[PDB]
Ligand binder design. Sequence first.
Ligand SMILES: [Ca+2]
Lengths: 268, 270, 273, 250, 91, 91, 91, 91, 48, 49, 49, 49
Amino acid sequence: DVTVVYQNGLPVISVRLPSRRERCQFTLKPISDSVGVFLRQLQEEDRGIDRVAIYSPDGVRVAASTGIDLLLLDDFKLVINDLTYHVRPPKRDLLSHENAATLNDVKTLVQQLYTTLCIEQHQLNKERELIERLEDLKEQLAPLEKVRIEISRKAEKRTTLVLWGGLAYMATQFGILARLTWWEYSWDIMEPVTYFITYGSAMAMYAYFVMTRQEYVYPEARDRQYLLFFHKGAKKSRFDLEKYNQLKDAIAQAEMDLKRLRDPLQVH
Amino acid sequence: DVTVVYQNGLPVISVRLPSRRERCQFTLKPISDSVGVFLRQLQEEDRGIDRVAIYSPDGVRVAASTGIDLLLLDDFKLVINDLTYHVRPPKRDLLSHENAATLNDVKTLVQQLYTTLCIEQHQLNKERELIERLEDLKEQLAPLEKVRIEISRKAEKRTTLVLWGGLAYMATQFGILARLTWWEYSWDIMEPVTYFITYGSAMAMYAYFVMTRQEYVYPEARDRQYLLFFHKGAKKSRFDLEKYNQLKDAIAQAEMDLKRLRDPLQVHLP
Amino acid sequence: DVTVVYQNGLPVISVRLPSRRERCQFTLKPISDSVGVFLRQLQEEDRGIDRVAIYSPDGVRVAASTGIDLLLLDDFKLVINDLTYHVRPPKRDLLSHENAATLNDVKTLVQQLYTTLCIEQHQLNKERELIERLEDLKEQLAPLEKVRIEISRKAEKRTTLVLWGGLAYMATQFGILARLTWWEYSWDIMEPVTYFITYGSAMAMYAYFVMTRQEYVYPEARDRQYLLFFHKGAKKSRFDLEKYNQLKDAIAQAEMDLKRLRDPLQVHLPLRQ
Amino acid sequence: VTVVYQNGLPVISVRLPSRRERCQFTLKPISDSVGVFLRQLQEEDRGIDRVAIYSPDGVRVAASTGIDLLLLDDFKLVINDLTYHVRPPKNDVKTLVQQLYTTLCIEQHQLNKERELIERLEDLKEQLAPLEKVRIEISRKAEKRTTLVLWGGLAYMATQFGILARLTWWEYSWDIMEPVTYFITYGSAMAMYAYFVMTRQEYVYPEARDRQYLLFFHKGAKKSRFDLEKYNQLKDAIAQAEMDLKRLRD
Amino acid sequence: DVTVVYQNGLPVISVRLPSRRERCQFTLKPISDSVGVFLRQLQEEDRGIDRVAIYSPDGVRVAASTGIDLLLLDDFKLVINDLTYHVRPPK
Amino acid sequence: DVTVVYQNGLPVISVRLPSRRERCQFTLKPISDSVGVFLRQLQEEDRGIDRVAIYSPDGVRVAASTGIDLLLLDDFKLVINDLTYHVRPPK
Amino acid sequence: DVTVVYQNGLPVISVRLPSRRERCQFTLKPISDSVGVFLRQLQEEDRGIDRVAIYSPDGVRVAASTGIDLLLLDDFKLVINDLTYHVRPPK
Amino acid sequence: DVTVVYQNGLPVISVRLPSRRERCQFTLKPISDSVGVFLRQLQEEDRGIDRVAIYSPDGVRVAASTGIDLLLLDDFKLVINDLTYHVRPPK
Amino acid sequence: VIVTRSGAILPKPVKMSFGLLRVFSIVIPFLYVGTLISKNFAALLEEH
Amino acid sequence: VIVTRSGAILPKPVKMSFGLLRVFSIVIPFLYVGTLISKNFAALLEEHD
Amino acid sequence: VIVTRSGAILPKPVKMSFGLLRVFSIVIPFLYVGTLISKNFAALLEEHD
Amino acid sequence: VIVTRSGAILPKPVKMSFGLLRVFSIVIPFLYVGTLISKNFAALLEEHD
Ligand SMILES: [Ca+2]
C-alpha cells in the first residue's frame, strides 16, 4: 500500500517501487517542492518507471505546477506505470475553516510546551551567564588599570610642560623686540627681522604639514603629542598595550548585549 | 563493521571498502549534505563499488534527498555490493516523545494554516501595493521637477555672478594700490591705507558673524547666498514648496521601507 | 468545456489536451505569474502541442509579461493545435469591508508564526552561501590589485615631489628677498613688493576656491591632486576601474551581512536592518 | 609544513624529495576539496608515484572532503615515502519555543505598553511646565547678557580703529606708531593662544559665544535656584519615551 | 486502424498519430530495419507519444532487435499511449 | 509546375520557390537523407517559406524518415505555404 | 521461468522482466553476437535492471566476451537484480 | 588460483576478481586475441582493478601485442592490484 | 549642504530683524569716541 | 579622502571647462580698470585741490 | 551647541583653577628675560664688530 | 578625541624616515640657489640697464 505519515514536522510518503519490489520512503518539503520535483525524485530512485502521474479523484490530472502543500489537503491517485494507488492517508482532521478556533489551539500547545520544558529558568540562566561573563571581564582589567592611570598622569604633565613652554616662548619673543626696537635700538632695522620671522613661522607651519601629513591646528597637535608621549612612555612600563584595547572592545560589546537583552519592549 | 564517531561537532564515518581491503573516512555536514551526496561521494571514491544503498531498520529504503540529521536518529543498514553492514550511531537526541510530538503538532498545524488561505499571495500583494505607491508618488514629483530646475538654474547663475564679482572686486583693489605706490605718489603715503583696509576687512568679517550666526568660511558663505536666492526667487515663481518637500521626504521613506521588506536575509517574500 | 474555478483563493483551470485526451488542472498564481510562462507550463505538460495561443475576442493577441488578473476577467479565447475554446471566469465578490477586520490580522499573525519556525535553517544556509560568495569575490580580486598598486606607487610619488617642490618654492622666496634687502637694495624700496606677494597669495587662495569648490586646506589639496594623478595614470596603464570599485563594494556588502549574521547565530537576540 | 591564512588563503608550501623547488599552493575553504588540490599538485611535477593524506589515526581521509573540514584537525600528508605532520592554526529547541512563545505575546504586550507610555509622557509634561516657565526667563537673561558681549566686542573693534586713525593722520605720523600697530597684532596672537591653553578649546567665533552663554547661564541658574539637575532629567526622560513610542508603531 | 500493404514486397504501415489526427505511412527495408527503428520513427515523426510497444503472440513483448522480416509472419498488437491497435498482416 | 529529372542514378527535385520567385534543384542520396531532410532543405534554400508538407498516396502524409528512393513508387502532393504541386516522380 | 526454444534456426529466449511483470522474447544471432551484447539488450529493453549476469558452471561468472553459442551448449544460471533463474537450453 | 583449462580447443582462464569476492572465467582465442585484448577484458569486466601486467621470464613486462600462442609456452606471473599470481600452463 | 539626506531642500535661513542698520549705527559713534579720546590723551601726553 | 568606506576609490572630480582662461580674462581687464580708475583720480584731486 | 539633541542643557565647561594668574605670571617673567637677553647680547655684539 | 567610543586608545602616530634631518637639508640648498639667482639678477639688470 501507499501511505503517508507526519514525521518530524514533515510528511513522509511510502511507496512500492516496481523493480526489486522494495518499499521506499520520501521525506518531502511541503512549502517549497512542487509535484514535478516529487515525480522526478521517483524516477531518480528507480529508473524503470516510464509513466508516473498524479490524478485528482474525479478524473483530471493534477498537473506539475501545483504545490505539495496544495495537494496534501485532499486525496489523490498515484499511478506508476500500469498500477494504481488511491492514497488517502493525509487525514486532515481540522474541520473548522474558521480562524480563531484553529488559532487558539496553538496557544494551548505552546503554553503547554512552555511549562513542560523549564524554559523560563533557561532564560534567567542566560541572563545570569551574561553578567557572569561581564564580571570576569571587569576583573581582568582592574589591576592593570593602575598602570594606565600612572602613564596618563605623567604624559599629561609632559604635554602641559610643552604648552606653557610655548606660551613662554612667545612671551620671550615679544620682549626681545619690545626691548630693542623702541628705545635701545632703531625701528627701521627691526622691520625686516619682524617680516622674516613672520614668514618663517609660515614656513615651519608647512614643514609640519609635510612631516606629519595633517594640518597644524592647536587642538589637533597637542593630542598627537600626548599620544606620542603615551606610546613611548608605555614602551618603558610594558603593560601589554594591545591587551587593554582588546579588553575594552569586548566589555563594550557585552555591555551593549546586556542593554539589548534587557529591552523592556520585547519580553526576553 | 562500519564506525561513526562524532568529531569536532560533525560525524566521521569509517568504512571498509571492497576494491582494496583498507579503510577510509568520510566527513560530511548534517545540515547541508543529504543521503544522495554521501552515496555519490562513496561512489566517486572507489570504482569497483557498483551498488550502494541505505536501508532502515525495516526493509524500506531511505531515499536520496533525506537529510543526514534525519538519518542519524536510529541505527541503519548500509548495503555495499553483496554484504550488509549494520551501523549504529550514538543516540544523543535529548528530547522526549511527548516533547517531540507537541512541537511537531505545532509545526504541522502552522503549515496547514499557512497553506489554507494563501498567506504568501497576500504577502506578495503588500509588495505590489508599495511598488505602486512609490511610483504614483514619484510621478507626482515629476511636475515639480521642471519648476524646481528652472529656479535652481536661475539661483545658480545669480550666485555664479556673485562669486565672480567677488574676484573682480579682489582685482580692482590690487590695481589701485599698485598704481599709487609707484607712479603718482610713493609708498610713504599709501603705507597706512593698506593697513586700515586689511583691518577693516578683519572687522567686516566680524560684522558678518554678528549678523548671521556663523563664520566667514568660503563655502559656508556660498551655500547661504545660493539658498537665500533660491527662496527669494521661488516665492515669486509661486510654487508651493511644502508639497515638494513633504513628497520628496515621503519618497525616501517609502523606498527605505521597501528595501527593508526585500531584505534577502530576513525572509518575507518567496 | 474549459472551467476556471476558485479553490482556496486560487484560480484552477481545467484544460483538455490532445495527446493523452485527458483534462489537466493548473493552479495559477494570480499576482506573481504571467501568461507567457503559463503557456510554457501548458507546453511542458504535453509535448504534442505544436502551437498554443490566447487572446481577447476583439483584440489580436495578448502578449507575454501580462499579469493573470488582467487576463482573468474577460471571457477570453484559447487556441490549441487546430482547436479553439472561449472561456469565462467567474465574478469575484468581496467580504473584506467588515468581515476581514479579524482576517487581515490573522494573516499577519500566521505569517509571523511561519517566519518564527522557518528562519533557523535559513540563516545557516544564507551564511554558508554568503561565505562562499565572499571568497569567490576575493579570488577574483587578488590578480587585479597588482595594476592598482603599480599606479599608486607612482601617483603617490608625484604628489610627494610636488609637496617638496612647494616647500622649495617657499624657501627660495625667503632667500631672494633677504639677499635683495640686506645686501643690494633697501628695505624701504622692496617693501611694496613684499606686501603684494602676500596679497597675491591671498588672491590665489580665492581663485582656487572659484575654480574648484574647496577651501584650500593643506590635506584637502594633495588628496584632490592624488586622485587627478591616479585617474591620469589609469589611462596610461589602461586599467579597468569600474569592475574594481564594483568588486570592492560587493565585498563590503558581504562583510556587512556577516556582521549582521553574527548576532542571531551567536547571541540569539533579534536582528536589525 | 605550515598553514597561514593572513592573506585570506592558507598558504601551504611543500617540496618533493630531491627537488630544489618549494612549491606554494592556494586553496579555498569553501569551493576547494582534497581532489582538485591533489590535481593542481600533480599537474605541476613528476614525483607522483604516490600521493595520499592519512588521518593522524593512520586511516585515509576520502579525497572529496572539504578543506575547512580538513585543516580544522591535523593530518599526515604523505607523498611517495615521506611524512609531513601539519600544525595548522587551531538548546536549539528551547530557543525556538521561546521565539514561538514570544510571537504570541507581542500583540497584547505592545498595547499594554503604549497606554503606559502615553501616561508617562503626559505626567512628565505635567512635571515640566513650572520648570520651563523659569527656564525661559533665565535663558532670556543669558541671551541678553551674551548679546551685550557680542556688540561690545564690536565696540572695541570699532574703537581701536579710531585711536589708530587719529594719530597717524593728525598728530603722530606712521613711522613712530607702526611699532605699536605691529605689537597690538602680536598681542592679539598671544591672547588667542592663551585662550586655547587656558580653556582647552580653539578660538572660533560660534563656539566662544556658546562658551560665554553657558557661563552666563550657570551663573544665573544658581542665583535664581533653578534645579537644573531636575530639568536635564525630565528632558532626557521625555525624549527617551518618545523614541520608544516611535518604535512601537512599525 | 492500421493497414499494412505489401507494395512490391516492401511493407508500408499506415498508423494514425494521436497528436493531429491524420494518418501517416511508413516504409521499411525489411532486413536493415528492426523493431527499434520503427518505434523510433513513430516517436520521431510524432512527439506526443511516450510509450510504444509491439506484442506478437498476444502475451509477450517483442524486443528492440527483432527484424521486421520476423515480425510480419504473424499478427501483432501495437500499443500507443493508451491505445491498442491489433493489426493483421497479409501473408 | 514541377519537372523532376533523374540524374546520375538519383532524382533531382525541381521546386518552384514561391517567396523568392525562382525554381531551384538539389541532389539527394536518400539513405542518409530522407523526406524530412528534404523538407529542411526547402526552408534552408528559400528562407521565405515556412509551411511545407508532402502528401504522397493522394490520401495521407509520409514520415520525415522515409527515403525518396522508397518514395519513388507513388506520386506526391508537395505543398508549400499556400500552393500545391501535384507531381509524379520519374521511374 | 526462462526458456530457450529454437525458431527457424535462431534461439528464442523468453525472460520475465521485473519492471512491468511481463514476459519478453529475444532473438539472438549466435555467431556475431557476444554475451556482452545480450546483456545490453536487456538493460535498454528494461532500464529498471541494474545488475544482470550469467553463471555458466553454476559457480563462477562468465566474462562478457564469450560467444553466445558457447553459452548455449551447456546450461547456466541467469541472475537479474536479485532473482536467480536456472535455465537449460536444449540440443 | 589462476587456472588455464582447454575446452573446445580453447583456453578458459579463471581469475579471482576483488570487487565481488568470487571467480570469473574467460574465453581466449589465441590466434586472434593478443595480450592487450586479455588486459582490456580485465579493466572492462571489473573496473575496480587499475594496474595489470604479465611477467613471463620472471624479469620483464611482456609486450602489449604478444599473441597468446606466443605467451602460453612458459609461465606468466600475473599482477593484480598488489597480488601476484604465478600461473602454470597446460601442455 | 544645500540638500538634506532625502534630497529635500533646507529651510530658509534666518536673518535678524532690520539688522544692517543695527550693525552700522554702532560703529560710527564708537569711531568718533575712539577719535575724541585720541586728542584728549595726546594733548596731555604732550604736556606731562 | 582617497578611499571610500568600502575601500573603493573615489571618482575623478570635476575640473572647470576653460577655467584657467576664465580667471585671467577677468583678472587682467579689471587690473586695467583698477589702473585707469585711479590714474584719473589723483590728477582730478590735484586739479580740485 | 547649547542644547543636547534630546533637549537638555550642557554642564558647565571646566575653567582652570587659578586661571588667569598663570598666564599673567608666565608672560611677565619671560618678558623680563627677553628684556635682559636682548641688551646683554647687544653688549656682546656691538663692541666686537 | 584621543579615546574612542569604547574607551580604547588610538594607535601610535609615526614620524617619517628621519624627516627632521632632511627638511633641514632641503630648506638650505634652495635658499643658497635663491640668494645666488638674486645676486645674478641684481647684477644682470645693472649690466642690462
Ligand atoms: Ca610697513
